[PDB]
Design a protein around this ligand. Structure first.
Ligand SMILES: [Zn+2]
Ligand SMILES: [Zn+2]
Ligand SMILES: [Zn+2]
Ligand SMILES: [Zn+2]
Lengths: 275, 268
């Protein structure tokens, strides 16, 4: 199984067909594809945009969690999609008489929401043919202050009783997911945290010269050549490339990645499920 | 692969998760599940009811046929679903900014629709927790009358007979009461009956299957002589089962019934 910077990664992203990228240790799915069964067990769903290959599985995801008596999921969407997504769920309810319980959380670009005491999300601007946004998940953890770092637990414990503040809150961009986008998201000055996230999940719909950059840009997509051109500004520990055109074989993908300069290439991974 | 009375059968049916049963030589999908890629090449989609494990894949199926430049599919639904399904397409059209071209055919129970010169479908009543119907596909062929095996053709005598044969019956989700409905006689004569048996052994009672609008294998067994089908294809087993448990249950059936039973075990 695929693992990136310690995180298992599941799911699939074929450029024409479906995109659902799953981080099961975060209970997170980035887009819903055709509702792969592995996605059903994730409590948090982040929708980048309303193309059917990204959003089409949404009602089935909610319905299946309901059937299995799982906690209603929390679903993050661009704010402008709240209207149609409400309409969608009410239509299905009007037919199938089910509850389709969920928490729908519209986010505008730059807005944040808490997933858990130690986890939060922030939406960021992406550049695509229809309304869209990416998401950065941040860890929010307590870390020992420098002066207490090398200290026996017994000692730490008494400091706790006395009531000393012994930790600092550390907020770190952990996973950044673009969904479909042009490479210009990299140049948007609001996106600095995207470029420092431990893992960047970004589409590279086209990876070799069989397709031209400006053609990639024609449909709101990114060419691997553009990621390379900007690689010096990508401070991510890992880059997970997704959403390759269905025209490609897995071996073509590997070839394209292998051709990258070695220092950058060492940080590059590919989600090849289904290729 | 799975072949039933000469028909390749593809797709998947897992109770509560996804149902899409594909007869590719008929360009037919019975329900759409989560839109398995194999379904996209079928030009005919027959929807039994609106539960999301049966209908959720619908917009993706239409969208993908458009991307491949295949003809807009003809989609059959219970007549009562016409307004909300029309609306659903309009809503996805707006969201994905795509045409989602299709031909929606509301079919009332008993109504028929010509699929090909030699093929037609008819809806039939099923008994489920929400409105539902099954479908029977008939062949319609012209064959020389036995006696003649030109001057009679010129004279304008009918020398052929039009033979209408029930070929595939698909129930979708239903209680076994579909067997009792006298309007469903042809269902019980179809060459292949594709019927759900959500539960297949005594770990669950018949009554429990019925509470949720489903059929227990035991009910089919207990009425097996009413079924004149050449083949019975069981589908929609509860996800609690393994393939081995399904095979065990079928193996217990009496030889006359057992010889005609097949199961769609994909994913089990
Ligand atoms: Zn896409
Ligand atoms: Zn898109
Ligand atoms: Zn079902
Ligand atoms: Zn049902």
């Amino acid at each position: 199984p695929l693992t990136v910077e310690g995180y298992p990664v599941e799911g699939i992203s074929i450029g024409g067909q479906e995109t659902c990228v799953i981080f099961p240790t975060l209970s997170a799915a980035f887009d819903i594809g055709r509702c792969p069964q592995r996605a059903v067990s994730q409590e948090f769903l982040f929708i980048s945009h309303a193309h059917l290959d990204h959003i089409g599985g949404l009602p089935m995801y909610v319905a299946t969690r309901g059937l299995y008596r799982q906690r209603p999921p929390t679903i993050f969407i661009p704010a402008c999609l709240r209207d149609p997504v409400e309409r969608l769920f009410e239509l299905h309810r009007s037919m199938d008489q089910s509850e389709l319980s969920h928490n729908l959380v519209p986010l505008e670009i730059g807005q944040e929401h808490e997933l858990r005491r130690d986890l939060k999300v922030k939406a960021f601007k992406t550049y695509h043919a229809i309304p869209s946004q990416g998401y950065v998940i941040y860890t929010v953890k307590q870390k020992l202050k420098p002066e207490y770092l090398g200290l026996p637990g017994s000692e730490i414990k008494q400091l706790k009783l006395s009531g000393v503040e012994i930790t600092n809150t550390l907020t770190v961009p952990e996973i950044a997911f673009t969904g479909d986008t042009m490479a210009d998201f990299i140049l948007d000055p609001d996106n600095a945290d995207v470029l420092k996230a431990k893992i960047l999940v970004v589409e590279s719909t086209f990876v070799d010269d069989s397709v031209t950059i400006e053609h990639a840009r024609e449909y709101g997509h990114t060419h691997l050549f553009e990621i390379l051109n900007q690689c010096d500004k990508l401070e991510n520990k890992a880059i997970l490339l997704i959403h390759f055109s269905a025209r490609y074989t897995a071996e073509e993908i590997d070839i394209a990645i292998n051709k990258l300069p070695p220092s950058f290439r060492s940080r590059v991974h590919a989600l090849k499920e289904g290729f």
